[PDB]
Design a protein around this motif. Structure first.
Motif, PDB file in Angstrom:
ATOM      1  N   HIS A 277     -24.968  29.450 -10.898  1.00  0.00           N
ATOM      2  CA  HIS A 277     -24.778  29.394  -9.456  1.00  0.00           C
ATOM      3  C   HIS A 277     -26.185  29.476  -8.865  1.00  0.00           C
ATOM      4  CE1 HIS A 277     -24.355  31.453  -5.422  1.00  0.00           C
ATOM      5  NE2 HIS A 277     -23.925  30.215  -5.257  1.00  0.00           N
ATOM      6  N   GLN A 278     -26.930  30.490  -9.305  1.00  0.00           N
ATOM      7  CA  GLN A 278     -28.319  30.704  -8.905  1.00  0.00           C
ATOM      8  C   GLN A 278     -29.124  30.856 -10.201  1.00  0.00           C
ATOM      9  OE1 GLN A 278     -28.981  33.802  -5.813  1.00  0.00           O
ATOM     10  NE2 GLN A 278     -26.952  33.307  -5.023  1.00  0.00           N
ATOM     11  N   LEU A 279     -30.330  30.285 -10.250  1.00  0.00           N
ATOM     12  CA  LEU A 279     -31.160  30.379 -11.456  1.00  0.00           C
ATOM     13  C   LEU A 279     -31.336  31.813 -11.973  1.00  0.00           C
ATOM     14  CD1 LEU A 279     -33.959  27.676 -11.011  1.00  0.00           C
ATOM     15  CD2 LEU A 279     -31.660  27.468 -11.894  1.00  0.00           C
ATOM     16  N   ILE A 280     -31.558  32.743 -11.054  1.00  0.00           N
ATOM     17  CA  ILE A 280     -31.702  34.148 -11.399  1.00  0.00           C
ATOM     18  C   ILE A 280     -30.450  34.805 -10.839  1.00  0.00           C
ATOM     19  CG2 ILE A 280     -33.077  36.195 -11.192  1.00  0.00           C
ATOM     20  CD1 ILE A 280     -35.440  34.320 -10.296  1.00  0.00           C
ATOM     21  N   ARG A 281     -29.693  35.493 -11.684  1.00  0.00           N
ATOM     22  CA  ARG A 281     -28.446  36.099 -11.236  1.00  0.00           C
ATOM     23  C   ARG A 281     -27.980  37.094 -12.286  1.00  0.00           C
ATOM     24  NH1 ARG A 281     -25.749  36.546  -6.281  1.00  0.00           N
ATOM     25  NH2 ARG A 281     -23.694  35.508  -6.256  1.00  0.00           N
ATOM     26  N   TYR A 282     -27.355  38.171 -11.833  1.00  0.00           N
ATOM     27  CA  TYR A 282     -26.847  39.195 -12.730  1.00  0.00           C
ATOM     28  C   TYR A 282     -25.448  38.868 -13.252  1.00  0.00           C
ATOM     29  CZ  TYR A 282     -30.746  41.861 -10.722  1.00  0.00           C
ATOM     30  OH  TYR A 282     -31.991  42.284 -10.314  1.00  0.00           O
TER      31      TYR A 282
ATOM     32  N   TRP B  86     -32.727  44.539  -7.124  1.00  0.00           N
ATOM     33  CA  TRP B  86     -32.228  43.183  -6.948  1.00  0.00           C
ATOM     34  C   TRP B  86     -33.376  42.249  -7.290  1.00  0.00           C
ATOM     35  CZ3 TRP B  86     -27.316  42.415  -6.837  1.00  0.00           C
ATOM     36  CH2 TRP B  86     -26.833  41.114  -6.594  1.00  0.00           C
ATOM     37  N   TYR B  87     -33.080  40.973  -7.504  1.00  0.00           N
ATOM     38  CA  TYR B  87     -34.125  40.010  -7.824  1.00  0.00           C
ATOM     39  C   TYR B  87     -34.698  39.474  -6.526  1.00  0.00           C
ATOM     40  CZ  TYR B  87     -30.105  36.935  -7.109  1.00  0.00           C
ATOM     41  OH  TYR B  87     -29.014  36.315  -6.565  1.00  0.00           O
ATOM     42  N   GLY B  88     -35.940  39.012  -6.586  1.00  0.00           N
ATOM     43  CA  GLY B  88     -36.610  38.521  -5.399  1.00  0.00           C
ATOM     44  C   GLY B  88     -36.246  37.166  -4.834  1.00  0.00           C
ATOM     45  N   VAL B  89     -36.009  36.171  -5.689  1.00  0.00           N
ATOM     46  CA  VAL B  89     -35.730  34.826  -5.203  1.00  0.00           C
ATOM     47  C   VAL B  89     -34.358  34.241  -5.517  1.00  0.00           C
ATOM     48  CG1 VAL B  89     -36.804  32.540  -4.935  1.00  0.00           C
ATOM     49  CG2 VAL B  89     -38.163  34.499  -5.775  1.00  0.00           C
ATOM     50  N   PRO B  90     -33.555  33.938  -4.477  1.00  0.00           N
ATOM     51  CA  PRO B  90     -32.214  33.355  -4.633  1.00  0.00           C
ATOM     52  C   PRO B  90     -32.425  31.858  -4.756  1.00  0.00           C
ATOM     53  CG  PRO B  90     -32.645  33.611  -2.324  1.00  0.00           C
ATOM     54  CD  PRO B  90     -33.817  34.278  -3.063  1.00  0.00           C
ATOM     55  N   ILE B  91     -31.983  31.270  -5.861  1.00  0.00           N
ATOM     56  CA  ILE B  91     -32.169  29.842  -6.083  1.00  0.00           C
ATOM     57  C   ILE B  91     -30.834  29.197  -6.398  1.00  0.00           C
ATOM     58  CG2 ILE B  91     -33.599  28.117  -7.233  1.00  0.00           C
ATOM     59  CD1 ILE B  91     -35.314  30.469  -8.332  1.00  0.00           C
ATOM     60  N   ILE B  92     -30.147  28.749  -5.349  1.00  0.00           N
ATOM     61  CA  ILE B  92     -28.852  28.088  -5.498  1.00  0.00           C
ATOM     62  C   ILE B  92     -29.083  26.857  -6.359  1.00  0.00           C
ATOM     63  CG2 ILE B  92     -26.963  26.921  -4.320  1.00  0.00           C
ATOM     64  CD1 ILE B  92     -27.601  28.821  -1.852  1.00  0.00           C
ATOM     65  N   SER B  93     -28.415  26.829  -7.505  1.00  0.00           N
ATOM     66  CA  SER B  93     -28.579  25.745  -8.467  1.00  0.00           C
ATOM     67  C   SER B  93     -27.355  24.889  -8.742  1.00  0.00           C
ATOM     68  CB  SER B  93     -29.075  26.330  -9.785  1.00  0.00           C
ATOM     69  OG  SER B  93     -28.218  27.365 -10.223  1.00  0.00           O
TER      70      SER B  93
ATOM     71  N   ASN C 213     -34.398  26.789  -2.982  1.00  0.00           N
ATOM     72  CA  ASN C 213     -34.546  28.196  -2.647  1.00  0.00           C
ATOM     73  C   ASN C 213     -35.290  28.443  -1.338  1.00  0.00           C
ATOM     74  OD1 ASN C 213     -37.223  27.522  -4.069  1.00  0.00           O
ATOM     75  ND2 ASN C 213     -37.574  29.507  -3.093  1.00  0.00           N
ATOM     76  N   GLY C 214     -34.967  29.574  -0.728  1.00  0.00           N
ATOM     77  CA  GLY C 214     -35.634  30.035   0.474  1.00  0.00           C
ATOM     78  C   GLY C 214     -35.935  31.481   0.089  1.00  0.00           C
ATOM     79  N   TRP C 215     -36.136  32.369   1.056  1.00  0.00           N
ATOM     80  CA  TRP C 215     -36.318  33.773   0.712  1.00  0.00           C
ATOM     81  C   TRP C 215     -35.052  34.447   1.212  1.00  0.00           C
ATOM     82  CZ3 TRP C 215     -40.031  31.191   3.634  1.00  0.00           C
ATOM     83  CH2 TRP C 215     -39.792  31.200   5.021  1.00  0.00           C
ATOM     84  N   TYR C 216     -34.866  35.713   0.866  1.00  0.00           N
ATOM     85  CA  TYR C 216     -33.691  36.466   1.264  1.00  0.00           C
ATOM     86  C   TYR C 216     -33.736  37.028   2.674  1.00  0.00           C
ATOM     87  CZ  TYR C 216     -30.795  37.249  -2.972  1.00  0.00           C
ATOM     88  OH  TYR C 216     -29.903  37.116  -4.019  1.00  0.00           O
ATOM     89  N   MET C 217     -32.554  37.132   3.279  1.00  0.00           N
ATOM     90  CA  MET C 217     -32.396  37.790   4.568  1.00  0.00           C
ATOM     91  C   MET C 217     -31.795  39.089   4.022  1.00  0.00           C
ATOM     92  SD  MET C 217     -30.382  36.798   8.104  1.00  0.00           S
ATOM     93  CE  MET C 217     -28.678  36.572   7.510  1.00  0.00           C
ATOM     94  N   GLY C 218     -32.419  40.216   4.350  1.00  0.00           N
ATOM     95  CA  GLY C 218     -31.967  41.505   3.849  1.00  0.00           C
ATOM     96  C   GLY C 218     -30.475  41.769   3.807  1.00  0.00           C
ATOM     97  N   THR C 219     -29.761  41.289   4.815  1.00  0.00           N
ATOM     98  CA  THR C 219     -28.318  41.494   4.899  1.00  0.00           C
ATOM     99  C   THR C 219     -27.518  40.958   3.703  1.00  0.00           C
ATOM    100  OG1 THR C 219     -28.093  39.542   6.366  1.00  0.00           O
ATOM    101  CG2 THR C 219     -28.248  41.710   7.415  1.00  0.00           C
ATOM    102  N   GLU C 220     -27.983  39.864   3.108  1.00  0.00           N
ATOM    103  CA  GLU C 220     -27.281  39.281   1.973  1.00  0.00           C
ATOM    104  C   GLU C 220     -27.199  40.246   0.798  1.00  0.00           C
ATOM    105  OE1 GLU C 220     -28.442  34.834   1.470  1.00  0.00           O
ATOM    106  OE2 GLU C 220     -30.116  35.842   2.476  1.00  0.00           O
ATOM    107  N   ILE C 221     -28.225  41.071   0.639  1.00  0.00           N
ATOM    108  CA  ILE C 221     -28.271  42.034  -0.455  1.00  0.00           C
ATOM    109  C   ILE C 221     -27.586  43.339  -0.060  1.00  0.00           C
ATOM    110  CG2 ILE C 221     -29.772  43.263  -2.038  1.00  0.00           C
ATOM    111  CD1 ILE C 221     -31.969  41.120  -1.367  1.00  0.00           C
TER     112      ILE C 221
ATOM    113  N   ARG D 269     -23.857  42.769   1.775  1.00  0.00           N
ATOM    114  CA  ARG D 269     -22.911  42.004   0.973  1.00  0.00           C
ATOM    115  C   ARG D 269     -22.985  42.299  -0.531  1.00  0.00           C
ATOM    116  NH1 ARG D 269     -20.731  37.807   2.965  1.00  0.00           N
ATOM    117  NH2 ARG D 269     -18.988  38.352   1.573  1.00  0.00           N
ATOM    118  N   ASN D 270     -24.031  41.816  -1.194  1.00  0.00           N
ATOM    119  CA  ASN D 270     -24.177  41.996  -2.640  1.00  0.00           C
ATOM    120  C   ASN D 270     -23.993  43.424  -3.135  1.00  0.00           C
ATOM    121  OD1 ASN D 270     -24.666  39.257  -2.503  1.00  0.00           O
ATOM    122  ND2 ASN D 270     -26.905  39.438  -2.831  1.00  0.00           N
ATOM    123  N   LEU D 271     -24.493  44.397  -2.386  1.00  0.00           N
ATOM    124  CA  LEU D 271     -24.343  45.783  -2.802  1.00  0.00           C
ATOM    125  C   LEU D 271     -23.268  46.532  -2.019  1.00  0.00           C
ATOM    126  CD1 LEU D 271     -28.196  46.446  -3.033  1.00  0.00           C
ATOM    127  CD2 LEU D 271     -26.656  46.040  -4.957  1.00  0.00           C
TER     128      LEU D 271
END
Ligand code: HEM
Ligand code: HEM
Ligand SMILES: C[C@H](O)[C@H](O)C1=Nc2c(nc(N)[nH]c2=O)NC1
Ligand SMILES: C[C@H](O)[C@H](O)C1=Nc2c(nc(N)[nH]c2=O)NC1
Ligand SMILES: NC(=[NH2+])NCCC[C@H](N)C(=O)O
Ligand SMILES: NC(=[NH2+])NCCC[C@H](N)C(=O)O
Lengths: 361, 361
Positions: free
Chosen positions: A128-133, A210-217, A234-242, A245-247
């Protein structure tokens, strides 16, 4: 028969619009003749570096759900339409991560891989994203959203250590192969940020990161009828997404109750608005953390503010603004931004990015 | 000609649906014959106490934008279709306020006034809400949203003291009159709540306060083709409406920067998320205040929770659920509730409540 028709139509529309923005209006005629014969000769056409480079930007500009569209014309386009092997793809993906991260100063980028030919993909990215848990079950372990893919990866020989933050490997399939190949990500290439709070020391006891760069793949980039099913951006993260939402989501990491614990508030009554206070401290922690490690990130107020500026420019350029209100508003304090107080036309305009069916599941 | 047709059609649809829910399915035939002749004889029909009483409940049930629909069948319906004079209307409105407030234990109610006859109104309520603060300009004073109406009231001889919390008077027009009449609200009838904080003493320096009962008085209640342009209704407040909107919006009271001051945080950087922290403390203050004065109020988590229960009952009853996602989600922490994580069919179903053009402006 019908496919060769749709292609030609989409091409005429795109070249005109593209060359008009590029100031190459006279070159449209000659360029369309070349394309017409190319579609007849082969059954498709090949974009020029300038065309897909600007088509990728236009698509970003038409992404109704993206709040960071003000930076559309600064997209770093990486042309990798010359890849033939799984090593080429792997290296390109490694390159994308390295160049995008840019030692923290994230650079909005996109790597263009070969597009579909006769409807068939040349490169199929599963991630989904290159870097992802990863995500697992017995009781929740990791990121629930990664479950179906984690299972698929494990069906290929990969095994996660079962921590809450296992890096999924790169998994993709080349044309002609039945099963995808995978490659563990080199940690030296991956920036992660431990989450801490500026005023609350105990926050580190949560051991969040969390990882630094979200890369929708896994999205399709459609430009002038050409389907680039594989074009990681990829762009950079908007704090709210992490943080919001994510956490925060019960279906994701579900950390709110635990955050309430470390900040010292009770979770007994909704009237105390502990979830809200929890979200604010978790979100402040996120922003402070990325900034502290030198990784780009943006708070939702700065982002909405930048997006307002975007709307103005689109008005100034003579272009119709399109957007999805439900996705433009941040999950925290939406009424505090201008986005909440207006409406958006959620019409689909091409070029753009689209969802595509997941190979797994 | 065409009006007598639409009326009959809407009536057939409503009686059937109504009597079906009421267990009076056999009485439908005889009831429709009476209505058919009534429409021919006069040009309209008169609902029974049971019909409008349940039609008012159904309408609430179909209100896509209302989050408190779980309490639809408990609506206290007050039939005032017998009013003829401006004194009757005034007393009915005074009565509504008294009975709804109920010394704090707010009772969801609705006062039904005579509906439109040949498209013409019998009673025209100008007030947006029965209890509402005025708004003025030179610099902002009061509630900006009340400006156009405050000007209209002042064009009738009424004058506000120009504080931020001036109670607008009741202003309505009877059939046959060119201009509306007005009546200052008896303060003994109006509950207001000063806003204070449970842990921060300095909060009272903001001198904020709000009224206890929101009574929307300018919406049309449409039931079986009958247009009750005047049917003031009320529920209790969800804290967010006051704290995250009425006192937060830049276009309303715009108090966030001032809240940041009294709670001791800086307003210098968005990355500190001061607006969010400000909203949380302002909202906690609101909930704590109403509760302390013995006035009903509900926090957004309890409300969403009650609304989830509502969705389940509609599924259990066999009815299609309709809603407006953009209005169901609370302005603060929407992702923390289930409403954010799902979609709603925003179709219009009658009976219902509708917007109508404002007489002023
Ligand atoms: C430069 C910083 C950027 C920011 C701050 C930004 C921010 C956002 C945010 C907050 C979302 C919502 C994500 C979610 O809720 O899951 C989003 C969605 C999206 N963004 Fe961006 N974006 C950026 C760059 C980009 C770039 C480089 C592209 C493409 C070239 C882009 C394309 C999109 C698209 C297609 C979506 C929808 C994704 C989906 O449906 O999952 N954005 N963006
Ligand atoms: C009993 C407690 C109630 C609660 C907690 C509740 C809550 C809400 C909330 C939060 C909204 C959004 C208001 C806004 O954003 O301006 C709303 C809207 C609405 N409610 Fe309620 N409500 C209640 C009772 C009622 C009753 C008694 C009726 C009608 C019989 C009703 C009819 C509606 C309608 C039509 C709307 C839309 C109003 C508009 O468009 O301005 N609600 N409600
Ligand atoms: C579809 C999903 O369940 C939900 O309706 C939406 N999700 C999101 C949203 N907003 C953002 N930015 N991202 C989401 O994932 N709002 C609406
Ligand atoms: C129309 C208005 O400007 C705005 O788009 C909406 N207002 C409201 C909203 N939500 C609620 N509950 N109330 C509003 O007034 N969300 C959307
Ligand atoms: N700001 C962005 N570029 N976001 C893209 C999507 C990121 C996704 N919502 C996440 O939290 O992982
Ligand atoms: N909970 C309710 N009944 N709300 C009705 C509308 C109230 C309006 N939003 C206000 O803050 O004044």
């Amino acid at each position: 028969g019908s496919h060769m028709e749709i292609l030609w139509n989409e091409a005429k529309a795109f070249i005109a619009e593209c060359y008009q923005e590029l100031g190459k209006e006279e070159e449209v005629k000659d360029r369309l003749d070349s394309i017409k014969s190319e579609i007849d000769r082969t059954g498709s056409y090949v974009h020029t570096k300038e065309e897909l480079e600007h088509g990728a930007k236009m698509a970003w500009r038409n992404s109704n759900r993206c709040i960071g569209r003000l930076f559309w014309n600064s997209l770093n386009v990486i042309d990798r339409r010359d890849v033939r092997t799984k090593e080429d793809v792997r290296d390109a993906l490694f390159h994308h991560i390295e160049t995008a991260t840019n030692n923290g100063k994230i650079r909005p980028s996109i790597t263009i891989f070969p597009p579909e030919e006769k409807g068939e993909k040349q490169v199929e990215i599963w991630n989904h994203q290159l870097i992802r848990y990863a995500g697992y079950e017995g009781e929740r372990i990791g990121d629930p959203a990664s479950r179906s893919l984690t299972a698929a990866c494990e069906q290929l020989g990969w095994r996660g250590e079962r921590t809450d933050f296992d890096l999924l490997p790169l998994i993709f399939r080349m044309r002609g192969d039945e099963q995808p190949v995978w490659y563990e990500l080199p940690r030296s290439l991956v920036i992660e940020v431990p989450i801490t709070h500026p005023d609350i020391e105990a926050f580190s006891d949560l051991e969040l990161k969390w990882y630094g760069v979200p890369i929708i793949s896994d999205m399709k980039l459609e430009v002038g009828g050409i389907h680039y099913n594989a074009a990681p951006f990829n762009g950079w993260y908007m704090g709210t997404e992490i943080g919001a939402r994510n956490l925060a989501d019960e279906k994701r990491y579900d950390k709110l109750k635990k955050v309430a614990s470390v900040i010292g508030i009770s979770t007994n009554y909704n009237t105390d608005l502990w979830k809200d206070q929890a979200l604010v401290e978790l979100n402040k922690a996120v922003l402070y953390s990325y900034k502290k490690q030198g990784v780009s990130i943006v708070d939702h107020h700065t982002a909405a503010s930048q997006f307002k500026r975007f709307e103005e420019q689109e008005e100034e350029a003579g272009r119709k603004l399109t957007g999805d209100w439900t996705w433009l508003i941040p999950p925290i304090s939406p009424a505090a931004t201008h986005i909440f107080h207006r409406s958006y036309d959620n019409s689909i305009v091409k070029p753009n990015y689209f969802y595509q069916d997941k190979p797994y599941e």
